[PDB]
Amino acid sequence: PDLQMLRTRITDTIRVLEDFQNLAEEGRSRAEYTNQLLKDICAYYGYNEYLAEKLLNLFPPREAFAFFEANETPRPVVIRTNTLRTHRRDLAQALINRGVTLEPVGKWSKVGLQVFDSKVPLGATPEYLAGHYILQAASSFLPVMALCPQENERCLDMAAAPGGKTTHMAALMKNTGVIFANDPSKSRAKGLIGNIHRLGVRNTIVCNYDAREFPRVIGGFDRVLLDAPCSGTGVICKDPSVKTNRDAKDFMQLPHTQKQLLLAAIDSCNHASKTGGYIVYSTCSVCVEENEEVVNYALSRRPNVKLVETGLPFGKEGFTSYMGKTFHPSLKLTRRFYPHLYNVDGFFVAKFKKIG
Amino acid sequence: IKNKRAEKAARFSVPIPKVRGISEEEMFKVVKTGKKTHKKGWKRIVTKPTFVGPDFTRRPVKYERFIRPMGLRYKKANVTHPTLNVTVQLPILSVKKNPSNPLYTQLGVLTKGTIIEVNVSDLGIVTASGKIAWGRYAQITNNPENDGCVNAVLLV
């Protein structure tokens, strides 16, 4: 039908839901109004009923509208400067002299810059070719800041296929220590090794493993990062398949794998660590079935681990309760990011300390 | 399909750093300025239409001297769905098999009867599991070297 008419119906329905008690109909109910909104938004934004209903259930009407706008809108171009090669000011000065529009992403990061437009390809700059910066997203900035690594540590990245998080870790460990970068994909492991060598990381071990096998393989890591595979509900702009290709069986399969991966990470980290016993669970999904369900599972089936403060600038507290499921009260510490609040992909981070 | 495209491109379009790399002709001219002695016939131009994908890519030394011009590159094809009888313009995702030459299918040469990967998202084809297809096989069934357009029939 007419997409302008569909949007007009969406706006009218949001207003009706805002002022249902005052502005209503003769006998039509709030359930009917929400059904009209759901059908309209599925027909306009090209979502399926299942995922659209989860997103509408998670957000209030107006905030849901903003969330869907943000999902339809491409996120900004951000570059992480390599501390192992240069620093932000010199890199920005060189890129500005080369003809690109650069400025710091904010006060939360000291090692990142935003590009407003360019005159030359940013992947073709001599600085990039020498490994002075990497094209990366703020959502991937956050997990390393949560798992700030120290020098001379042994760390395990359980899904490091792109390589940005691994290179961030090695920059903060100042090319000291050992990093175990794992990928289940060899074709993407090619690009991972390429980024590692371009950015100049000498403390890495690239392995092709299912991440559930690490307590068997080596285990005992000082710090563990788990960017779990997920639905991709926070990266809808980059992968528009999520809108119509995520249903009940998928949302049952993925969380089970996430549970097993988090349990493997917990078992692979060690308790008696002289410098850190931290596991960071991370994902780019906003769905509850993929968020804080895994954390409640972890806290309920290994009591030898506890949630700690993320030490992280921004975000909202996680959901202590939801549609019937009551969670462990500590999940308010886990923090959550949305594209419309913060112009960063929908993201979720959680920090664990082992105690036994 | 066109109305959906117009809505998206008219009211979900936002400023984004949008640039492209230089062409293989520019790269070849630069490396030739760098290399004086020109071996005779060191440049063979691919004179057939091609699909590439990215813009500023560095090719392996195996293929580094194959030059595919901008005037011959193609990005979209007129793809016909037979059962849902309709032809639409769709982007080309990859080149899967040129039945004339493995070198052609490596280079992305588009000839008659050539299997390519096409984005079929706009069609809204529902799969058996209930999902929307994001890529299908389509056979180029015209002579793109003689016709300034690429015509494909979708194998569904």
Partner: peptide, 14 residues
């Protein structure tokens, strides 16, 4: 309006 005024990444300079 759902935009943290301190650290929301803008699309345009400054």
């Amino acid at each position: 309006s759902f935009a943290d005024p301190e650290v929301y990444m803008s699309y345009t300079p400054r």
